[PDB]
Each structure stands twice: as structure tokens, then as C-alpha cells.
């Protein structure tokens, strides 16, 4: 239903989600020197998204402000866990443990994507409230 033509929050999620996918689809073949930049992009996209959300909040009912604030925290935490596991993987490059560390990476990225989508889902529900749907 909603018109996304200048929905910067939707535009940014889509980027953060595209970013996680490029990484996810690239990672197994890839060295540390290729995968850290990938995680860098993920983080930049996250940063952009959270800024856009920071600006969108004031135009939205106070009744919703904390669900969103918490979603926001959650995303920071996930990029937290992802950076963590990235660091493990570098530490263990060329080892019997390299794989399980990439797998914990995908897991973190995929959680980020999924929570970023949850944040879009929150903020949509707040705009629907503000534009007054039935």
C-alpha cells in the first residue's frame, strides 16, 4: 500500500539488506582483505540508516518512539556481533576453524538484515498511524 517514492528509510534498509547479501553471497571463497571491506559497507549502510531514522522520529507519534529506539539499539548490537565474528575469522585464517567462523558471520549478518527489516516494519506502522489509516 505505502508509496516508497521518497521513503528514505525504506531506501536505506534496502541498501543495508543488499549489503548483507553481497557479503553473504561472497564470503566463502573470500580472504580477510576482501571480507573486511564488505563488513565496512554493511556498517556504513547501517550508519546511514540509523541517521535517517534519527531524523524521522520527531515526525512520528511519541507512543512509538521507544519501540524504534530499541530496534535501533538492536541493529547496533548485531553489527557488534558481526564485527566480533569477523575478527575471529581473520585470527583463524587458514585454519580448521575458519569456516565455523564465516558461518557465524553469515549468521550475524542475516540477523542484522532480519532486524533491519523489523525496523522498517516498526517505522511503517508508525507512519500508518500518523497519516491516519483505518
Amino acid at each position: 500500500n505505502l508509496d516508497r517514492s521518497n521513503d528514505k528509510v525504506y531506501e536505506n534498509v534496502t541498501g543495508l539488506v543488499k549489503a548483507v547479501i553481497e557479503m553473504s553471497s561472497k564470503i566463502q571463497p573470500a580472504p580477510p582483505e576482501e571480507y573486511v571491506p564488505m563488513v565496512k559497507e554493511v556498517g556504513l549502510a547501517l550508519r546511514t540508516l540509523l541517521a535517517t531514522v534519527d531524523e524521522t522520529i520527531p515526525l512520528l507519534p511519541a507512543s512509538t518512539h521507544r519501540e524504534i529506539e530499541m530496534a535501533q539499539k538492536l541493529l547496533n548490537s548485531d553489527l557488534g556481533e558481526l564485527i566480533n565474528k569477523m575478527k575471529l575469522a581473520q585470527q583463524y585464517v587458514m585454519t580448521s576453524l575458519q569456516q565455523e567462523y564465516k558461518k557465524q558471520m553469515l549468521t550475524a549478518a542475516h540477523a542484522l538484515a532480519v532486524d533491519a527489516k523489523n525496523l522498517l516494519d516498526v517505522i511503517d506502522q508508525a507512519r500508518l498511524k500518523m497519516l491516519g489509516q483505518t
Binding site: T14, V17, V20, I21, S24, H110, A113, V114, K117, L120
Partner: peptide
Amino acid sequence: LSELDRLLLELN
């Protein structure tokens, strides 16, 4: 959104 959802689907 169905497009954002189509991405999400690629991740599972």
C-alpha cells in the same frame, strides 16, 4: 516491499 522481501528470501 515484495522486492525487499525477495531479497530477504535470498538470505535464509
